[PDB]
Design a protein around this ligand. Structure first.
Ligand code: VIK
Lengths: 300, 237
């Protein structure tokens, strides 16, 4: 079990760690988060009490280094940093644990939610979407735009998701205009899967990462990306059976985790009604269709 | 974006543009079968592609063979239309290619946009204008070339005859849509108006009769009357 210590908590803040969250008061004796499960990526995120504007946070994997959080009073945010001195770090964590100044990652043992939401998400792939190679962790916030949004403005600070555009030469073969537009299997299977993602695991990982950035930071371009990657599958007549079954599981857990009160801003009515009721795959997402109809029947 | 009454004059500026109307591409007669079911029989159709500034009409005749063995023909017809308009643009010299294509029905937007991805600088636009181009097949010479075709064929016409020698494109489009709206509202009445006088003929190389300026004013008045009439017979006013 790994630990992300905090130097201190000088400003009042709501702290998120994956799907959990807790409040820290200004100057409260808070020194971090312990018992973080090894084997998964994780996200530690922040919303300041005095400016709920800009949710921000850091994707990291404790197997890749010793990471800590320290408030920067100049840039006005909690920053993730790497401690290279392993003995310094172990000494710091032990002191903070002995003084019981850390919250424990509150995983219920029955509970596979975080695994199910991050099954295909890899830190190496996150770092290609979020370019900042001098760090092993990746910063994301509510306002960051995607490479595609920037084509329709700072490139260093963008989300480099894979561009999906259904009315693009990449998506449409000359001479198959109607066929490729009404049945996107070519675009999904040859262009995206064989060509760009190489396999369905990488595709699902980007899909899962897009959803999580939409949910945790209200990142609009991430929500667009999540829906586009769903729609490309649902609009393809020819999809491997294992991908459909896995997609149904992925989406089920995303819909299950979504705050009920954010359904209005995180779910695109057109895409979901199309996907569940009109698309080629309208009968292939049994688990997702059942949870959507029982949880958000308004949207449909 | 969309073309409407606010940006009317844009049609007669010097940026090449075409209207595309697909309402006569897929045409059928519905009939009873020997078993007493219903079936359709396709008949020849046409794409109506018109430059409103010059009157040039690119009439692409759609022969019934293009539907053989195909499913979902009303959907295919939109994509076939888009295929043929795209092929027309590619066949034109660069300096004759349109800057904008205005589709009369919004369902043509995605088919045509997809077929024109190679032409990112050509704007594909809808319109809120209530254009009556479906009545093109009430023009006897257009109907005749469509019905006689035994193979796919493109035929070129000037839908304004020689009107532009005497009137502006704005006025010529005004007259064309009044004629077509009348033919659409009461074809028999409209055609009687246009032909009731045998001394006024249609030249071999024209579509409409050789009316003098004064005769066109009379004709145009009669067409308004007809449209107002039928509007009365229709709603009882
Ligand atoms: C020159 O424009 C007009 O004379 C009016 C347009 C509105 C719709 S239409 O088809 O009657 C043509």
């Amino acid at each position: 079990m790994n630990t992300v210590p905090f130097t201190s908590a000088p400003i009042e803040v709501t702290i998120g760690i994956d799907q959990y969250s807790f409040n820290v008061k200004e100057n409260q004796p808070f020194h971090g988060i312990k018992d973080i499960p090894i084997g998964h990526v994780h996200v530690i995120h922040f919303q300041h009490a005095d400016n709920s504007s800009m949710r921000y946070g850091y994707w990291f994997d404790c197997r890749m280094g010793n990471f800590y959080i320290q408030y920067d009073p100049k840039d006005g945010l909690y920053k993730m940093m790497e401690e290279r001195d392993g003995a310094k770090f172990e000494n710091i964590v032990h002191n903070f644990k002995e003084r019981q100044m850390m919250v424990s990652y509150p995983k219920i043992d029955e509970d596979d939610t975080w695994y199910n939401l991050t099954e295909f998400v890899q830190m190496d792939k996150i770092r290609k979407i979020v370019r900042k190679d001098e760090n092993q962790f990746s910063y994301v916030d509510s306002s960051m735009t995607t490479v595609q949004e920037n084509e329709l403005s700072d490139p260093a600070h963008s989300l480099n998701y894979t561009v999906i555009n259904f009315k693009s030469r990449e998506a449409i073969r000359p001479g198959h205009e109607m066929e490729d537009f009404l049945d996107k299997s070519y675009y999904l299977n040859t262009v995206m899967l064989q060509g760009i993602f190489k396999n369905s695991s990488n595709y699902f990982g980007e899909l899962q990462f897009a959803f999580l950035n939409a949910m945790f930071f209200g990142n609009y371009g991430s929500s667009l990306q999540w829906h586009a990657m769903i729609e490309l599958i649902c609009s393809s007549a020819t999809v491997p059976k294992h991908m459909l079954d896995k997609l149904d599981e992925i989406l089920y857990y995303q819909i299950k985790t979504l705050p009920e009160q954010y359904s209005d801003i995180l779910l695109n009515e057109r895409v979901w009604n199309i996907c569940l009721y009109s698309s080629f795959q309208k009968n292939s997402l049994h688990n997702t269709e059942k949870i959507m109809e029982n949880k958000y029947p308004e949207l449909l | 974006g969309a073309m409407n009454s606010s940006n009317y004059a844009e049609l007669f500026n010097n940026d090449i543009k075409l209207f595309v109307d697909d309402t006569n591409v897929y045409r059928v007669t519905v009939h009873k079968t020997f078993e007493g079911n219903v079936a359709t029989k396709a008949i020849n159709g046409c794409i109506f592609t018109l430059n409103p500034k010059t009157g040039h009409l690119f009439l692409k005749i759609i022969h019934t063979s293009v539907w053989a063995g195909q499913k979902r023909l009303s959907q295919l017809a939109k994509w076939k239309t888009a295929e043929e308009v795209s092929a027309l643009v590619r066949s034109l010299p660069k300096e004759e290619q349109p800057k904008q294509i205005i589709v009369t029905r919004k369902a043509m937007l995605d088919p045509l946009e997809v077929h024109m991805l190679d032409f990112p600088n050509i704007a594909i636009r809808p319109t809120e204008l209530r254009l009556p181009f479906s009545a093109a097949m009430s023009i006897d010479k257009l109907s005749d070339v469509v019905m006689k075709a035994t193979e796919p064929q493109m035929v070129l016409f000037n839908i304004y005859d020689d009107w532009l020698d005497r009137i502006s494109s704005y006025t010529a489009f005004s007259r064309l849509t009044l004629l077509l709206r009348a033919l659409k509202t009461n074809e028999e009445s409209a055609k009687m108006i246009l032909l009731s006088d045998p001394t006024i003929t249609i030249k071999s190389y024209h579509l409409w009769p050789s009316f003098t300026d004064e005769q066109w004013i009379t004709i145009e008045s009669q067409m308004r009357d007809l449209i107002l009439t039928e509007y009365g017979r229709k709603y009882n006013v």
